[PDB]
Design a protein around this ligand. Structure first.
Ligand code: 431
Ligand code: ZN
Lengths: 161, 47
């Protein structure tokens, strides 16, 4: 039930997502090992992901959270990078997309820094890099990230290194 | 998948060392996220 609609580079929505993408690139403590060496991206395409069933599943949970938390869903737009991006866009997030070894427990992880999610695009630790050149820093091959809507509700604050 | 801490709906990982790192977040239910944009890109070799 998923369809993908291309945004034009002329569209303000293309431009604002490109800007979140470009402006939240940071350097990473691995020197670019997981995700590659870059300061910016060549954005080739931005598509809106439309799936009614998945959307309603999201908004239902959002309301339950809100009502347990003085009417505050505490919703954010966050990046997600995953080898399972094709399954996620078609079937939604579930336990199969969880980071079992994540530092805050087996759950599904999102990032404010696009460059952080870029590290997971080819797998945890960047896997073996791109399918074609086996290069975690490939400048030729095309990559995909998700920019996602996330409900945090009452978030347990964990201070951490 | 684990559970949220009792009385909470997610975990926020507040960066407490790398001054430039933004926050990271964890949910324990797939239903608390929707994948709104698919961005196709290349990283660019610095000049
Ligand atoms: C199997 C698996 C494991 C982890 C991710 C993932 C994807 C993310 O975008 C991410 C962002 C911040 C911190 C951790 C993150 O982990 C994606 C897939
Ligand atoms: Zn490649």
């Amino acid at each position: 039930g998923t369809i993908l609609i291309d945004l034009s580079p002329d569209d303000k929505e293309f431009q604002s997502v490109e800007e979140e993408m470009q402006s939240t690139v940071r350097e990473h403590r691995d020197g670019g090992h997981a995700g590659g060496i870059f300061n910016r991206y060549n954005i080739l395409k931005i598509q809106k992901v439309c799936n009614k069933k998945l959307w309603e599943r999201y908004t239902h949970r959002r309301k339950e959270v809100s009502e347990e938390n003085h009417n505050h869903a505490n919703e954010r737009m966050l990046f997600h990078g995953s080898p399972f991006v094709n399954a996620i866009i078609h079937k939604g997030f579930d336990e199969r997309h969880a980071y079992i070894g994540g530092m805050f427990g087996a759950g599904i992880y999102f990032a404010e820094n696009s460059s952080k999610s870029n590290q997971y695009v080819y797998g945890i630790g960047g896997g073996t890099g791109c399918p074609v050149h086996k290069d975690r820093s490939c400048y030729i091959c095309h990559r995909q990230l998700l920019f996602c809507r996330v409900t945090l509700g009452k978030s347990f604050l964990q201070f951490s290194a | 998948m684990a559970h949220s801490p009792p009385g909470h709906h997610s975990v926020t990982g507040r960066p407490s060392v790398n001054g430039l790192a933004l926050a990271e977040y964890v949910i324990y239910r797939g239903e608390q996220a929707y994948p709104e944009y698919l961005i196709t890109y290349q990283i660019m070799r610095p000049e």
